[PDB]
Nucleic acid binder design. Sequence first.
RNA 1: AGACAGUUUGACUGGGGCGGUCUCCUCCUAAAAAGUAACGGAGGAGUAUAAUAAUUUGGGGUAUCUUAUUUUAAUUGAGAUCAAUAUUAGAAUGAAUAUACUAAAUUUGAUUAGAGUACAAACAAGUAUUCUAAGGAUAUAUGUCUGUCAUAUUGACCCGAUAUAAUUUAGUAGAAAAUAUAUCGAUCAACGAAUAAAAGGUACGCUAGGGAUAACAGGCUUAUGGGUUUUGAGAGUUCUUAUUAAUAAACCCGUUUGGCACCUCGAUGUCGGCUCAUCACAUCCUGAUGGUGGACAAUCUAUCAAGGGUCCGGCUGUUCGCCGGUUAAAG
RNA 2: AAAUAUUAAACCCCAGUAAACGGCGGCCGUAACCCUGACGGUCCUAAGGUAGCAAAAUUCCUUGGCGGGUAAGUUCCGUCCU
RNA 3: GAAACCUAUUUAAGUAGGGUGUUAUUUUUUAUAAUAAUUAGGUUUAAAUAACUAUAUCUAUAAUUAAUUUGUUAAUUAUAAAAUUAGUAUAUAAUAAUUAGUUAUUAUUAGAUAAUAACCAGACUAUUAGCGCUAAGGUUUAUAGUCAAGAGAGAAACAGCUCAG
Lengths: 57, 50, 143, 177
Amino acid sequence: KNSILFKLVSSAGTGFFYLAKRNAKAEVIKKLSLRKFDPIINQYVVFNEAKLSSGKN
Amino acid sequence: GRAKPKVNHHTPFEEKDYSELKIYDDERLMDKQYKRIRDEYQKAAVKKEH
Amino acid sequence: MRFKNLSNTKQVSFKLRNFKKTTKYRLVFGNSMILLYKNARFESIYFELFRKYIKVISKKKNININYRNCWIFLRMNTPLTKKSKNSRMGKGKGALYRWLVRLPKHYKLLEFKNVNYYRLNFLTKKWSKRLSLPLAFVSKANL
Amino acid sequence: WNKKGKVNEATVQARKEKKRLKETNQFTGDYTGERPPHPWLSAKRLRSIMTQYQVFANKNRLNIKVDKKDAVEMKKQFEEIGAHEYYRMRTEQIINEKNNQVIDQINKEIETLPFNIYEEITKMPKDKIYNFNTDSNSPYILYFEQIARMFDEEHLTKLKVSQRLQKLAEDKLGEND
RNA sequence: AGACAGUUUGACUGGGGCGGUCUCCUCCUAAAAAGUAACGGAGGAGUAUAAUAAUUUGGGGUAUCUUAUUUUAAUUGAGAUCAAUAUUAGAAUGAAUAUACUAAAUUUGAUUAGAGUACAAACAAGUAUUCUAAGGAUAUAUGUCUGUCAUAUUGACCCGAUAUAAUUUAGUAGAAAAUAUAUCGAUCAACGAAUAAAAGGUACGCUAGGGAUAACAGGCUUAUGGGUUUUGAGAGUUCUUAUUAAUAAACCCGUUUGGCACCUCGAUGUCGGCUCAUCACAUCCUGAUGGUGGACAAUCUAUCAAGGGUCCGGCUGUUCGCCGGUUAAAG
RNA sequence: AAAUAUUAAACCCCAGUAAACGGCGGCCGUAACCCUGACGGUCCUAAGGUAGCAAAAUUCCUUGGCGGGUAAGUUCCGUCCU
RNA sequence: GAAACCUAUUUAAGUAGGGUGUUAUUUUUUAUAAUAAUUAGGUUUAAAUAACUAUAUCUAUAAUUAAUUUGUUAAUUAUAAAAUUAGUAUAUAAUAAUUAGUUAUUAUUAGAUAAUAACCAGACUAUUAGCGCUAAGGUUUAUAGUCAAGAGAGAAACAGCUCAG
Ligand SMILES: [Mg+2]
Ligand SMILES: [Mg+2]
Ligand SMILES: [Mg+2]
Ligand SMILES: [Mg+2]
Ligand SMILES: [Mg+2]
Ligand SMILES: [Mg+2]
Ligand SMILES: [Mg+2]
Ligand SMILES: [Mg+2]
Ligand SMILES: [Mg+2]
Ligand SMILES: [Mg+2]
Ligand SMILES: [Mg+2]
Ligand SMILES: [Mg+2]
Ligand SMILES: [Mg+2]
Ligand SMILES: [Mg+2]
Ligand SMILES: [Mg+2]
Ligand SMILES: [Mg+2]
Ligand SMILES: [Mg+2]
Ligand SMILES: [Mg+2]
Ligand SMILES: [Mg+2]
Ligand SMILES: [Mg+2]
Ligand SMILES: [Mg+2]
Ligand SMILES: [Mg+2]
Ligand SMILES: [Mg+2]
Ligand SMILES: [Mg+2]
Ligand SMILES: [Mg+2]
Ligand SMILES: [Mg+2]
Ligand SMILES: [Mg+2]
Ligand SMILES: [Mg+2]
Ligand SMILES: [Mg+2]
Ligand SMILES: [Mg+2]
Ligand SMILES: [Mg+2]
Ligand SMILES: [Mg+2]
Ligand SMILES: [Mg+2]
Ligand SMILES: [Mg+2]
Ligand SMILES: [Mg+2]
Ligand SMILES: [Mg+2]
Ligand SMILES: [Mg+2]
Ligand SMILES: [Mg+2]
Ligand SMILES: [Mg+2]
Ligand SMILES: [Mg+2]
Ligand SMILES: [Mg+2]
Ligand SMILES: [Mg+2]
Ligand SMILES: [Mg+2]
Ligand SMILES: [Mg+2]
Ligand SMILES: [Mg+2]
Ligand SMILES: [Mg+2]
Ligand SMILES: [Mg+2]
Ligand SMILES: [Mg+2]
Ligand SMILES: [Mg+2]
Ligand SMILES: [Mg+2]
Ligand SMILES: [Mg+2]
Ligand SMILES: [Mg+2]
Ligand SMILES: [Mg+2]
Ligand SMILES: [Mg+2]
Ligand SMILES: [Mg+2]
Ligand SMILES: [Mg+2]
Ligand SMILES: [Mg+2]
Ligand SMILES: [Mg+2]
Ligand SMILES: [Mg+2]
Ligand SMILES: [Mg+2]
Ligand SMILES: [Mg+2]
Ligand SMILES: [Mg+2]
Ligand SMILES: [Mg+2]
Ligand SMILES: [Mg+2]
Ligand SMILES: [Mg+2]
Ligand SMILES: [Mg+2]
Ligand SMILES: [Mg+2]
Ligand SMILES: [Mg+2]
Ligand SMILES: [Mg+2]
């Protein structure tokens, strides 16, 4: 398989987020960060990369 | 690019006549056993429409 | 079948339960010819039996000809698979034991250029008696 | 009667080798057959170039402003300096026309020759037509002591001198000077 | 601690079992609408990717061949040629050439919400996208963009979980907890998934059903098998047909090995031997005759012919078969 | 409410047990002839079927080969050993 | 007055929904058949040939080899343009009839909705294909018809063929 997920969180403390993929075996230096829409604010803001959980049992 | 425009050599009465000769041959290669059973009723109607 | 990779690939072709075709015969290269007169599965041994007897006609010692006598265009087309003896039906298709040529009705088996009219009529009659097929011989003379 | 042409494997590999090599580079080092340069150049002297060329690429119109007073004078200066030059430049355009006519007259007449010499002139060796070597007569040499003193600055002469050591380092025309 | 117990121990299938398969994609089959099965033929999928995506801009049109060039080509110039090739992320088909390939500048539309039609379609599921609103990119925009040329690139519901645009009543107020918007976890691959949780033997065997389903036998078929007929490689002193016969070919028979699974599954059957028989002729002897490389004899071959006849014994469970001995012959 | 520290039998590791079960090799070349292989190497194994018997109630090819008995014996006796 | 078809199923002799049947209701045709016009298609056609497998010829121009009959004689090669032929399940630029969709006309008489049952083992023949000895009353699909659920007359006698309902 060789893929991993991660969620993109807002600079604001809304907790809204999107998803994305990257391969596990790469050696990326640059974490992602993008300008996207937080409907809670009705405005674009800078999103940044973060960790995603998993399912336990 | 061998392609060159098509030609209707054969006149129309050939292709009619060619389709007819194509039957007279295949009718000769038949089995006689199939041929009389076909030709036993297939005649009678003609004598019975006439 | 598939002509791409003949030897490499394993080949299968549908038996054609009723296949009939007629192709209007006409001479192109030469004067006289032999032509088939019935749809048929033309084997190879139907040719190799009377292969020498054509060489004795078309080719002779100490005689040189520039142009060409015979034009052949025969190639194999049908694998003709089969099952073993004690095998039930189903469980796949049979395996090979031969190859053949499926020919149409009016097929130029041979095309000749200035070859003895008197021998080919003596040949094709014996040809057709071994094979029990209807075959014909044609020359530009009679036409 | 002509049919389509099939592909050569040469065009195949070039299409593929690039994609292997867009990431990598062929210029980086002795991967390419590369001799080292004239040893007058040094690791520190390239950094002297890089560190200051890094500065020049980072310049823009927004790192800089200019006073209008400096600007308005810059018109009349470079306008009239150019006006003298348009007079100069447009002469060369007129000059080169008449020069090329002279070439056209003779090329008509070169046909009007005997068989022997007409071969050579058409079939000259390119080595003779390919002479781009310098001479004692070069207007950078002939006028060097004059031109060294006519400028307003030594720097603008240093623009020339440092320029040559590069070109001398390229063609390897400098050695242990 | 099978010491003891309660239970499971898939299905399809040309009998069943062993083996193989079980979902999804593309063509042939498929018979010019769509659809169309089979343990029919073949190949593939369980991904990739933050640039391989979005808007603008530039470049040679690509490809095949020849040739010349300050020996150089971002992708040089010229000429001819190409039932659209080159390619278009991977299988196959289909299509595009404003494709595709390549260089570059700005950038995240691979954003949020709500209404609705059409195709397809048992159901559920799946598909394409216009219209309305907010908030952005591109930059003449006048306009274009709601992931990739397309089709596969996966999984229901329950339970549970992290972040949260919203609400709350087990007396009241809070905690707890439930639900809601966004979202994550399965080769549950027997892929509509019966459970979180599952293998075998029965020659000690039982019951209910079935000729819906097998072994002997009948019936259909006759590749195979046996025999007739035509042709005649090659032997026969010469010489195709005294004798012999490869190969190729046209029909017959229903005695072998088998294919199918129509009758019988609601008391029976298997080979062999004793006794008892009957029929065919494609005849082993006897009887008639032609031919002969037939001197006589003995013999070989073919035709007509079913009147009567056609062995005992040793070994073996044995038909058969080898052996001993015989006979007009031991069909 | 959660976590760390303390620890029993049992399980793992280790040891023992073969009139318990169970298991018991191959390759290369070598001697006045190929073949034969005492021997010598070669690789591996926990160890390499030792004694003895052997077409057996154990043998697929098999009515195995030779001999005995019988006018003649797929069974029987004796005997050899993939 | 049917069905033995599709789709799912620890399901295959079971069951469920669609489809077909009956009844009832309604100022009720979204219908069936026949004729004609009309649209796309890419089986078939084909002295067609783009592809694959194989293949027969022609030629400007530019050259070769041997020999003392080297101011001759003789034998030969390559090539732009031109250019043939056969075959195929998974080959077609192009291109039939019929079927199918829509519209109109005529004629029949149903359609829609609701309440609800049975069926979901099929057989043969004609045409057509796939496995099979293009063998089988064989086996699996498609388009009609008949048995099924249907007597009478003809096929010597005959569930499936003809006439007929
Ligand atoms: Mg138990
Ligand atoms: Mg237990
Ligand atoms: Mg119970
Ligand atoms: Mg079963
Ligand atoms: Mg079976
Ligand atoms: Mg169709
Ligand atoms: Mg067809
Ligand atoms: Mg079906
Ligand atoms: Mg697979
Ligand atoms: Mg692309
Ligand atoms: Mg462009
Ligand atoms: Mg060009
Ligand atoms: Mg793709
Ligand atoms: Mg492709
Ligand atoms: Mg999204
Ligand atoms: Mg519809
Ligand atoms: Mg739905
Ligand atoms: Mg999709
Ligand atoms: Mg898009
Ligand atoms: Mg559940
Ligand atoms: Mg209470
Ligand atoms: Mg309360
Ligand atoms: Mg489950
Ligand atoms: Mg299931
Ligand atoms: Mg299922
Ligand atoms: Mg489904
Ligand atoms: Mg017992
Ligand atoms: Mg019973
Ligand atoms: Mg039987
Ligand atoms: Mg028969
Ligand atoms: Mg036979
Ligand atoms: Mg002889
Ligand atoms: Mg002979
Ligand atoms: Mg039955
Ligand atoms: Mg019976
Ligand atoms: Mg019973
Ligand atoms: Mg009874
Ligand atoms: Mg007789
Ligand atoms: Mg008798
Ligand atoms: Mg008498
Ligand atoms: Mg005795
Ligand atoms: Mg006895
Ligand atoms: Mg005897
Ligand atoms: Mg022991
Ligand atoms: Mg021993
Ligand atoms: Mg013995
Ligand atoms: Mg003995
Ligand atoms: Mg003994
Ligand atoms: Mg009625
Ligand atoms: Mg039906
Ligand atoms: Mg199930
Ligand atoms: Mg049942
Ligand atoms: Mg229903
Ligand atoms: Mg209904
Ligand atoms: Mg087409
Ligand atoms: Mg043609
Ligand atoms: Mg040419
Ligand atoms: Mg043809
Ligand atoms: Mg076709
Ligand atoms: Mg059923
Ligand atoms: Mg059924
Ligand atoms: Mg059926
Ligand atoms: Mg059936
Ligand atoms: Mg049949
Ligand atoms: Mg049947
Ligand atoms: Mg059946
Ligand atoms: Mg009746
Ligand atoms: Mg009757
Ligand atoms: Mg009728």
